[PDB]
Design a protein around this ligand. Structure first.
Ligand SMILES: CO[C@@]1(C)C[C@@](C)(O)[C@H](O)[C@@H](/C=C\C(C)=C\C[C@H]2O[C@@H](C)[C@H](NC(=O)/C=C\[C@@H](C)OC(C)=O)C[C@@H]2C)O1
Ligand SMILES: [Zn+2]
Ligand SMILES: [Zn+2]
Ligand SMILES: [Zn+2]
Lengths: 815, 81, 61, 66
């Protein structure tokens, strides 16, 4: 029966729309089934499903893996179908999807390994001489894949034969293209075969056909690019023809030869690199005036590549290269040309990285004032890149004056709010530093004019500039009209746009975070009451900046505000600890710490205990976090007595709250807890003796956090004492209690050591009851997976019996 | 529920929802060691996704200090399946 | 203050324009390397090796 | 369960003891100064002690029961 095997090899649907377990099961079984099914039916059905027009990506991946596995087994039976498979999968190699290309190359590789080299060559040879250019490309890529799979020396004879063919130029072209695709695909793995490939393809540079010469030059360029920074004694028979050709050719072939020269030059020594550069340089200078916007890109790439070597020195560059470069490439025509714009910027930056920043920066800085703003943005980009890569050591009085005037005029002449002018202004002022004293009045006037009005998109950019430049602004003992700016920023506190309000708050914070409260002219007592209603705003930037500002005020100017308002502000901040953005929570923690450090722990702790007594779950958790924060900023010696006095209250759900607070407190303070373990030990004893399940579960959680908090600090006495009370709970059936007990045991494994844990497990490891054995082997496996190595020194001695030897004799040696 | 196949070079990510809490013990205090994930969990369309909720990743996933102390960072790819 | 800021801008713009006036007085075939398209203009070792391969495939079959 | 050396409620004395003997021999091979101690004690070259431990790795504690 024929459709017998078809109906049973619907295994591929078993896999396609199927579960992962049956996926792998059907995979293995169809792998065992392949040799008997036969390649005929298998491929006859799978290649349509792989040719499906709307198949998925991972369905394709699984199909490719199926092909790989069914191809490995049936090795020499795939020959009569190879051709067919290729016509299906010789595409997918020029596909715009990268993973499609990877999958096609993997399929062709496994096919070439399954079949032989002679079969692949015999099926692929007729399409070598085809006239359709679409076939000669897939053929070359497939030959490259076969060479990568079966090796280069296995294909070297066919290559040497095909590009010597006197029958047609198409075969020679396709052979050289095969060498080029091999280089492109394999990269730096061609280095042992570089000379073989070069001698195979070298005779094409002097062919009578112009297409053969071009493809030979492209193949040489590909090999030289794959070989870099090695490979140069293999490129020796090409130096004479390539340079004679750049001296005689003109056009497309000249461009190919020049690309080859440019990829070959960085492989030479100083002599040859220096000597060869002169020749190609006179040719390139001549070619500076040719037409195609491809030629300009190639010329720029070659200039950048050659000017980055050691054989070329700054003297020759500034003497011969810079005048024509800056005369021919720096015009706004280059600016509206979006294709080569980035190339020009990178080439200019990498030129300045060798010749020196001053010359480049001058030659383009005179051009910062221009009628076209595209040419302005280009110069600004190049200038700030050079400045960031080199800094500005060589700025002169004249150059400093020109820079400042130019950046000021560029700031005001701005249509749309851009980050380019902002970053340029910022980095220029930050690199000048304490040197810009009078342009500080000038810049302050400019930012005052920009911040005064105009739609708040200019105002928020001015606020960003203030935020990023206030350091150097005050760095020169000029704050005063600093206060003039702060007054205006204060008046700009009612804004309907939250984005502009964020920048305003950032600028105000950057100011006050460097302006002393004594001399911060707006009285702190007036500001803060204007500031406290903004804390209820719902924008994230506004909230974060407001909290940071109130925190700074409470940290430094605590004296002016009458307390009570600080208490209200902290009680309001309590609700921000649940914020779903880490930033908000981080700033809230910081500000709460500052306010607690300011007003004192006593009153806030009393209020926090009252709040912990009466509220719902989330607010009580936030109160616990707040108590831990207060106890960390003001030493826990100020919080622990008042918290332990609250445990003396006779009510349930009251002691459990105290236990949850102690748990989170120890987890939050970590190492600081080493001085407070003796104080909470009797309470944990009592709770461990408490009948309530939560009391023991929470006490176990406390033990775990305390154990992992103190580690390496010598607190083993109390921890062993507490283990003596934790251990009897191992026979507990409730899942939460036993989970907490396991957590506490694994914390004590770290704090107390694995030797004690093994000592607690030894007598139960082999108990007669299966319950005891289950529990003890779970604990033992947990102890064994962590610190398997230490247990070597702790195992007890076990005596030999009649049948087996159990003593470890090496440890009994005595030197 | 954990993938736990030996990992590699892909860096685990977290979404905006839980950014900054451990993937093992889901904790809110002190991150320590960068999370590495298996190659299959980062393959294809899965790159850069949250190691908890497969959604878009905005920050690097971390093991907390307590997990690295207990060597819970050496147990394999912690991507939740 | 706002009037002074507006004045300062006017003067800077005027100075730039005057300088510019002072200077001014003083003073494509499309071809891609991704194509084999040439612009206008227009025994064997491959068969021998192919014959050697064909011989191997025929022998295996 | 996937880790070698773990046990369960049906583990026998023989399996436990051969597991600890095997990882004891591996720990001896790993730590440089324990092998020094043994090679000084029994007056052998360290390569010989290593080879002896590897040979003992196969059947420590004798063949199993029944
Ligand atoms: C509802 O969504 C969930 C449950 C799931 C989620 C992962 O998808 C989501 O991202 C996540 C986000 C919000 C919440 C509530 C989770 C984490 C946060 O919770 C908060 C409720 C705690 N509050 C505290 O940490 C206490 C103190 C503060 C200031 O911190 C610190 C370090 O002192 C702990 C944690 C910081 O919660
Ligand atoms: Zn994974
Ligand atoms: Zn997520
Ligand atoms: Zn953790």
């Amino acid at each position: 029966e024929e459709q017998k095997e078809r109906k049973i090899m619907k295994l591929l649907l078993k896999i396609k729309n199927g579960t992962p377990p049956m996926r792998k099961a059907a995979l293995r079984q169809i792998t065992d089934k392949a040799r008997e099914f036969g390649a005929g039916p298998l491929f006859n059905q799978i290649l349509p499903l792989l040719m499906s027009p709307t198949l998925e990506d991972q369905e394709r991946h699984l199909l490719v893996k199926v092909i790989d596995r069914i191809l490995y087994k049936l090795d020499d039976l795939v020959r009569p179908y190879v051709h067919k498979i290729l016509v299906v999968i010789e595409p997918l190699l020029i596909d715009e999807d990268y993973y499609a290309r990877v999958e096609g190359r993997e399929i062709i590789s496994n096919l070439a390994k399954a079949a032989g080299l002679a079969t692949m060559i015999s099926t692929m040879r007729p399409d070598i001489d085809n006239m359709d250019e679409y076939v000669r490309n897939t053929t070359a890529r497939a030959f490259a894949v076969v060479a990568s799979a079966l090796g280069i020396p296995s294909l070297l004879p066919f290559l040497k034969a095909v590009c010597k063919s006197k029958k047609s130029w198409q075969a020679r072209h396709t052979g050289i293209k095969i060498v080029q695709q091999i280089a492109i695909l394999m990269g730096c793995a061609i280095l042992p075969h570089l000379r073989s490939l070069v001698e195979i393809i070298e005779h094409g540079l002097v062919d009578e056909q112009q297409k053969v010469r071009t493809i030979s030059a492209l193949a040489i360029a590909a090999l030289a690019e794959a070989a870099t920074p090695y490979g140069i004694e293999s490129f020796d028979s090409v130096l004479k023809p390539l340079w004679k050709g750049i001296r005689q050719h003109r056009g497309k072939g000249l461009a190919a030869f020049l690309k080859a020269i440019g990829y070959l030059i960085p492989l030479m020594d100083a002599e040859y690199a220096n000597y060869y550069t002169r020749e190609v340089m006179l040719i390139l200078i001549r070619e500076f005036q040719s037409p195609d916007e491809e030629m300009k890109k190639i010329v720029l790439k070659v200039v950048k590549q050659c000017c980055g070597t050691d054989g070329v020195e700054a003297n020759y560059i500034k003497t011969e290269i810079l005048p024509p470069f800056f005369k021919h490439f720096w015009q706004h025509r280059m600016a509206l040309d979006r294709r080569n714009y980035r190339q020009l910027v990178d080439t200019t930056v990498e030129l300045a990285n060798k010749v020196g920043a001053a010359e480049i920066i001058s030659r383009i800085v005179d051009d910062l004032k221009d009628e076209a703003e595209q040419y302005r943005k280009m110069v600004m980009e190049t200038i700030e890149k050079i400045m960031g890569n080199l800094g500005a050591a060589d700025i002169d009085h004249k150059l400093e004056e020109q820079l400042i005037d130019g950046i000021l005029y560029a700031f005001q002449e701005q249509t749309t709010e851009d980050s380019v002018m902002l970053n340029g202004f910022g980095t220029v002022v930050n690199a000048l530093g304490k040197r810009v004293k009078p342009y500080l009045p000038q810049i302050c006037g400019t930012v005052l004019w920009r911040l005064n009005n105009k739609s708040a998109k200019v105002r928020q950019q001015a606020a960003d500039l203030i935020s990023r430049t206030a350091v150097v602004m005050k760095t020169c003992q000029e704050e005063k009209l600093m206060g003039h700016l702060g007054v205006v920023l204060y008046e700009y506190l009612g804004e309907e746009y939250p984005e502009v309000l964020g920048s305003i708050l950032g600028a105000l914070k950057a100011i006050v975070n460097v302006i002393g409260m004594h001399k911060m002219t707006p009285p702190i007592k007036d500001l803060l009451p204007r500031l406290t209603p903004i804390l209820k705003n719902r924008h994230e930037k506004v909230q974060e900046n407001c909290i940071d500002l109130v925190g700074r005020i409470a940290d430094r100017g605590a004296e002016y505000v009458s307390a009570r308002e600080w208490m209200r502000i902290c009680f309001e901040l309590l609700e921000l600890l649940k914020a779903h953005k880490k930033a908000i929570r981080r700033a809230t923690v910081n500000t709460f710490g500052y306010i607690a450090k300011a007003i004192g722990p006593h009153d806030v702790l009393a209020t926090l205990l009252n709040n912990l007594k009466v509220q719902e779950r989330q607010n009580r958790v936030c109160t616990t976090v707040a108590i831990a924060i207060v106890a960390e900023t003001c030493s826990p010696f100020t919080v622990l007595p008042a918290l332990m006095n609250e445990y003396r209250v006779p009510e349930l759900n009251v002691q459990n709250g105290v236990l949850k607070s102690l748990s989170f407190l120890f987890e939050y303070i970590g190492e600081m807890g080493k001085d407070y373990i003796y104080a909470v030990t009797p309470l944990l004893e009592d709770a461990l003796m408490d009948r309530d399940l939560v009391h023991r579960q929470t006490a176990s959680a406390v033990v775990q956090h305390m154990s992992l908090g103190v580690y390496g600090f010598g607190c083993e006495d109390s921890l062993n004492h507490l283990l003596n009370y934790v251990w009897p709970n191992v026979f507990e059936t409730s899942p939460h209690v036993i989970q907490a007990v396991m957590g506490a045991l694994e914390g004590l494994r770290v704090a107390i050591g694995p030797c004690r844990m093994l000592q607690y497990c030894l007598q139960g490891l082999f108990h007669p009851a299966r319950k005891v054995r289950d529990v003890y082997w779970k604990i033992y496996n947990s102890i064994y997976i962590g610190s398997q190595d230490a247990l070597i020194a702790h195992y007890p001695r076990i005596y030999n019996d009649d049948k087996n030897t159990y003593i470890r004799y090496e440890l009994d040696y005595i030197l | 529920i954990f993938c736990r196949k030996q990992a590699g070079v892909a860096i685990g990510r977290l979404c905006e929802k839980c950014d900054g809490k451990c993937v093992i013990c889901d904790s809110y205090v002190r991150p320590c060691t960068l999370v590495r994930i298996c190659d299959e969990c980062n393959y294809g369309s899965y790159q850069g996704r949250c190691v908890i909720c497969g959604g878009p990743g905005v920050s690097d996933a971390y093991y907390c200090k307590e997990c690295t102390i207990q060597e819970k960072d050496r147990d394999g790819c912690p991507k939740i399946v | 203050d706002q009037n002074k800021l507006e004045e300062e801008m006017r003067k800077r713009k005027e100075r730039v324009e005057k300088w510019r006036e002072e200077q001014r007085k003083k003073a494509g075939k499309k071809w891609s390397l991704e194509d084999d398209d040439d612009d206008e203009d227009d025994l064997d070792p491959l068969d021998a090796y192919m014959e050697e391969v064909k011989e191997e495939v025929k022998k295996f079959n | 369960s996937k880790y070698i050396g773990t046990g369960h409620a049906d583990t026998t004395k023989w399996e436990w003891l051969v597991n600890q003997h095997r990882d004891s021999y591996c720990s001896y091979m790993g730590h440089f100064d324990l092998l020094n101690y043994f090679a000084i004690a029994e007056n052998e070259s360290k390569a010989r002690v290593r080879f002896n431990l590897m040979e003992k790795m196969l059947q420590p504690c004798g063949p199993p029961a029944d």
